[PDB]
From a paper:
TRPV6, a highly calcium-selective TRP channel, is overexpressed in endometrial cancers, leukemia, and carcinomas of the breast, prostate, colon, ovarian, and thyroid. TRPV6 has four subunits that form a transmembrane domain (TMD) with a central ion channel pore, an intracellular skirt domain enclosing a large cavity, and amphipathic TRP helices that run nearly parallel to the membrane and interact with both the TMD and the skirt. The TMD is composed of transmembrane helices S1–S6 and a re-entrant pore loop (P-loop) between S5 and S6. The first four transmembrane helices form a bundle to constitute the S1–S4 domain.
We used the TRPV6* construct that we developed earlier by modifying rat TRPV6 (rTRPV6) for crystallization. Importantly, in fluorimetric assays 2-APB inhibited calcium uptake through TRPV6* with a similar efficacy (IC50 = 156 ± 20 μM, n = 3) as in wild-type channels (IC50 = 184 ± 8 μM, n = 4). The TRPV6*2-APB structure does not exhibit substantial conformational rearrangements when compared to TRPV6* (the root mean square deviation, RMSD = 0.505). In each subunit of the TRPV6*2-APB tetramer, a pocket formed by the intracellular portions of the S1–S4 helices and the membrane-facing sides of the amphipathic TRP helices contained a strong density that matches the size and shape of 2-APB and was not observed in the TRPV6* structure. Notably, this binding pocket is distinct from the pocket at the S4–S5 interface that binds an activating lipid in TRPV641, agonists, such as resiniferatoxin (RTX) and capsaicin, and antagonists, such as capsazepine (CPZ), in TRPV142, and the inhibitor econazole in TRPV543. 2-APB binding is apparently mediated by multiple interactions. E402 in S2 appears to interact with the amino group of the 2-APB tail. In addition, the two phenyl rings of 2-APB are surrounded by the imidazole group of H425 in S3, the guanidinium group of R469 in S4, the hydrophobic side chains of Y466 in the S4–S5 linker, and M602 in the TRP domain. We have only been able to crystallize rat TRPV6 in the closed state, precluding a clear view of conformational changes associated with 2-APB-dependent inhibition.
Author numbering:
A (entry chain A), B (entry chain A): 28 to 403, 422 to 637
Amino acid sequence: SWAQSRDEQNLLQQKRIWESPLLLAAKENNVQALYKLLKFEGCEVHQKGAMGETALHIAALYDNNEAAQVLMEAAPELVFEPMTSELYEGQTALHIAVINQNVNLVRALLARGASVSARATGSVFHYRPHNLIYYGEHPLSFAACVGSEEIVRLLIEHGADIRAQDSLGNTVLHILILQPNKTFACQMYNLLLSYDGGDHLKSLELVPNNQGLTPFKLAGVEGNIVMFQHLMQKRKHIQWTYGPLTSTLYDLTEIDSSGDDQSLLELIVTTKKREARQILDQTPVKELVSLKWKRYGRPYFCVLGAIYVLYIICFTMCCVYRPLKPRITNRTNPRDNTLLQQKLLQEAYVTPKDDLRLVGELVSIVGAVIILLVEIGPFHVIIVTYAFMVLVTMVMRLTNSDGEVVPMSFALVLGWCNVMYFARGFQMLGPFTIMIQKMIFGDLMRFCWLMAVVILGFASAFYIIFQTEDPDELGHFYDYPMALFSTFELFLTIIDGPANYDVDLPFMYSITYAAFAIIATLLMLNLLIAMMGDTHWRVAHERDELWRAQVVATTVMLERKLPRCLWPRSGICGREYGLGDRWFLRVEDRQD
Amino acid sequence: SWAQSRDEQNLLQQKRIWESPLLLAAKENNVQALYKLLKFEGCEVHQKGAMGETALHIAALYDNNEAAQVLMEAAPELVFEPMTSELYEGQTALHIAVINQNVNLVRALLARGASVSARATGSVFHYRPHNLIYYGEHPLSFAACVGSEEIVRLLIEHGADIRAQDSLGNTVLHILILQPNKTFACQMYNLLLSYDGGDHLKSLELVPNNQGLTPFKLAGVEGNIVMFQHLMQKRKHIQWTYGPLTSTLYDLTEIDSSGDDQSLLELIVTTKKREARQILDQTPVKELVSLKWKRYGRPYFCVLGAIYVLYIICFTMCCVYRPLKPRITNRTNPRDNTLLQQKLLQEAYVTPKDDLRLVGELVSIVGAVIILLVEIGPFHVIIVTYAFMVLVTMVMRLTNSDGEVVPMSFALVLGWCNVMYFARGFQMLGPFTIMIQKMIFGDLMRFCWLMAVVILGFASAFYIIFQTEDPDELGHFYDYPMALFSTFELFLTIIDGPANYDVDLPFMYSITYAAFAIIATLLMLNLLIAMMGDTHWRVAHERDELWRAQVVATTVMLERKLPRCLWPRSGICGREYGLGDRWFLRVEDRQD
Ligand SMILES: NCCOB(c1ccccc1)c1ccccc1
Ligand SMILES: NCCOB(c1ccccc1)c1ccccc1
Ligand SMILES: CC1NC(=O)NC1CCCCCC(=O)O
Ligand SMILES: CC1NC(=O)NC1CCCCCC(=O)O
């Protein structure tokens, strides 16, 4: 494994420190032992350790300015030495002093003339979840993250480029957004903007990430509210203050769906970050998305819903009124238990009342392909498998298979269960269907493994009990799978429970069923108690917040496909008003 | 839209400020640029902006006393200039200085001799929910709301009329009741009473609103408890203090049902404000309404209930004993499945035991019209549609329609479900029926849209499954609507679930029904979890407080219609006791 290699390598490093008396004196800060190993008896002063480290690298890991200066005065070429290992490919003695906030050592390293543009491209500095931190690659990025503002400016004084980016295309501004201490990073964020070129163009705040992401836009996708609020101050204009009233004008540029994909709204709903959902509730955004839904958002959803309501009620109209026949096959020739009246008409006549079904079946297929034309959570796979069954039913049609009902049956339930997709938004039943959206694809698929286990124990027993018996009376279990299906219904207390009082029931049934009825209710009551985990207040607020998320996700969805002659752009543009042609949303609020 | 017009107009205003260098210097407080545009090069000093504003109006929006004085010394006619726009029709430069609490500017504006009676009748000053504030129209009303007591008296010093009202008929006292800061408005409320004429008659506290509402009475209807408690000090008399005991005598004039509609109790239950419900729980009112219910309130409700219990049990007595006939029509001539024994007697004989039904049917109709005579929440539409069915049944009678049962059936359920209206009050089951009162007309009408959706998917499938089959055995679904009604019962687990073990069931039934049973229980368990939202403590207190509301609403209802020889007036009158002929309620309490 990779996690054990670094565990072994870190253990392997301490061995080379103990063995090499130079690195041992560099670790323990033994000043007298260094002059004994350098000036008197010349040791290998460029001694590479297990992690490709020098004696100075060890003298910097443990804050030892004395042992560092003895190594720099007796060998001033160890300063430029980078780590020559795989885990630490690139790290130098300045990176270690900047991390440990050793200002006097950074001062002495910069007096010696160390590199202020050395990258630490080792695997331990990569942005991975198994790495506990991520401060970038450059020494300026290390100083900004640890919060040492004295070292930050001290590095700029010696020629540190704020523009420089790492292997992931992140400037020093992008790295500060991925940090825990947000309340102190806002002060650090302003400090690095002060060293910008001063020109309105080619600003550091506009340098994009390699995935097309500005520092402002990254704060929303990552869920950093403190940096989102702080970055919002730079892009909002107050119009006037009238006592308690204050009408402020927000910029509304990267926070709107104007680019083909560069949009902060399109990144909040698509990302899986549970934190980013709180950014559309922020005071520049929540005003926007509320107006997008109250007008032109909510009505178009009802139109698309009502159209889908009629389209599905038409498909059912074609099923209830389909071909007929009082059964051309002879009689109950296979087994006597058979109630079949096959309703298959391969002919295209019956013109009186069949011409209505002709256009009805034509509507169902051109709508099913339109559903697929616009496709070429869970309600997404339901609507596509529905239209797949329509074409398979159309393929089952014109071939006239005896299994003409099996593909047509799935399209019934999938067609309506996808109209409760429109429960999203619309009213206050949206959070109810997002509560079952988690239920069907969360606990259900796991909870059934425990219920099928209890069934396959009692069902495979009840069949043995009534295998000796006669299925003609009390035939709840007669087949191998029909014993499972009857016990399945018995687990939910739907069937009356096998009870024939004229005959004599086997002695094992009256014992096994008593144990089944108790265990089945305990599994059902404990299932109800397990539902109480989502009943504390936050969970009622969580699903109600997740409901607004999929409402905003629907609002952005309708704006993309719908035309532009309807649905005007958000805000009032910067033309015809003395603005910068960018949009703006006038939002006035009242304090207290 | 109207909300975008003001957004555009506010953006359009800033354009005219930037364009007009007079208004730009008036906004930016550029003193040197004003003398360059007034004394040297004469600009249009009466420059009307986009919002009908002058240069002084802009110099007052942004606290700029320097730019204001330069405009007033070089043009002392801008002070009287009001805003000449639609949004701000009437606002002057004094209103803006009073709002911003610019005391030195108000002092300088009143030294110039500005109008202290100018109304701001613009649409933005109207009492609308889209307007964030509402301070009235007069400058004295602006000073009182912002809390600047120095400007309040400074305006009175220059001839401000406290009596003046706005377009809604509200004095300065009415406006203070609609404000958030109540703890500081009580101090401001006393300040404006001190400037009253000093005579006991024509007081400012007695000037009514245009909707018949005194400042005291408005505080109760609006739900302002702090002003209700403060206003109560002026109208309560302490009789004696006996250690911990203190018997106080409350006025009880506008807080009783004496006028035809001027009554604080009649306004608390009729209004839809959820806050006003806490005013009948206040310590002058709660003592009253408790005594009104314990005696003469609760017994009369039981009498009216017991009368309605017997009146409805009589209507059922007339239905169970109605005309008979062993069926005059021939046999089962339409379809063989028919169990009809029509019980229709158009003749008025059968005198032995029919004379009891004659007066019984006469009682049911004179009581149904009495129910309508006294009519010419939900239990209000139930009782009126019940008596509507009685007359329709009376019209169905004497015409002898074969549908004589359909109008008579509705009157059965509506007659009893309106006797659990008497669960209101009576005992502690009142809050239980107010819990289902929200259920029937709240979640139910919305929750059914999701259940009918799941039914119309599985019901329209089960019919297709058993359309090939023979309805004679396993005929749960045979008609188009009977497939819906059987699946509806199956959704609530009432029917045993279609199970015929002698025949062979179609292969799609055993698959579709397994999916229906799971989805039906998940919709039922998630419905039970959705009920837990009203289980936190306040909701138990909310419905118990809403129960007392409809109890008090019933207590006031019974006092209006019932005669006056019974049910004496509340309190002890001010005659025969040295009082002012007004109630009074003696209430003693114990402190600690
Ligand atoms: N290709 C259509 C996308 O619309 B979706 C959709 C629309 C109607 C019916 C079913 C699905 C959608 C589903 C889940 C999340 C967001 C959108
Ligand atoms: N016109 C009769 C009014 O009485 B109500 C009423 C009385 C008896 C039966 C049904 C209704 C009433 C209903 C709801 C709220 C307040 C009163
Ligand atoms: C073995 C080490 N030698 C060294 O000079 N630093 C070491 C460890 C610190 C690096 C931690 C980087 C990380 O885990 O993110
Ligand atoms: C555009 C404005 N010009 C001005 O002198 N005041 C302005 C706005 C303040 C009025 C706010 C009143 C309200 O919204 O209630």
